[PDB]
């Protein structure tokens, strides 16, 4: 048992699509569909959980995994000055290598000490299945930041780390969406 800097709570939202929300209503929809999965406290639980995750593409379009630091609410409302760094991974093979890199960088405080100078700017990581006509295995990763200013630093850091983990320029695309 080797404790993480902070424990992270893993939740699941099945087939969370904007069209399913259109009949439901966000908090009314989130609290009604969210399923608790695990409370990750140590490195050993981190790898057990990550290596046991069911494939996002075998679950519906919009199936989402949320990793929340200290079990905080993963709401747009809670991060007014924040942003979402996006990573879209095209194939199932690259999605695993990418997901492993990003989650290890976040829960392992790699981003904290390499980019944020010791500040805990990232409190949420979201993993979504988002297949489109063109790419049916497309998985989206979201690195939620409390401060938008850090996005310019997180994007090249994540790009380099994915490239180093063996992903090519065509295996993933970097993006950003504000709150
Ligand atoms: C997590 N979340 C989801 N929604 C709503 O739920 C819908 C589906 O939720 P989503 O999380 O699948 O959309 P996402 O932002 O990833 O996709 P994109 O914006 O199309 O790139 C969204 O379109 C919102 O209307 C949300 N709406 C608000 N206000 N706040 C939230 O925290 C929030």
TrEMBL record:
<keyword id="KW-0648">Protein biosynthesis</keyword>
<dbReference type="InterPro" id="IPR023398">
    <property type="entry name" value="TIF_eIF4e-like"/>
</dbReference>
<keyword id="KW-0396">Initiation factor</keyword>
<dbReference type="GO" id="GO:0016281">
    <property type="term" value="C:eukaryotic translation initiation factor 4F complex"/>
</dbReference>
<dbReference type="GO" id="GO:0000340">
    <property type="term" value="F:RNA 7-methylguanosine cap binding"/>
</dbReference>
<dbReference type="InterPro" id="IPR001040">
    <property type="entry name" value="TIF_eIF_4E"/>
</dbReference>
<keyword id="KW-0694">RNA-binding</keyword>
<comment type="similarity">
    <text>Belongs to the eukaryotic initiation factor 4E family.</text>
</comment>
<protein>
    <submittedName>
        <fullName>Putative Eukaryotic translation initiation factor 4E type 5</fullName>
    </submittedName>
</protein>
<dbReference type="GO" id="GO:0003743">
    <property type="term" value="F:translation initiation factor activity"/>
</dbReference>
<dbReference type="Pfam" id="PF01652">
    <property type="entry name" value="IF4E"/>
</dbReference>
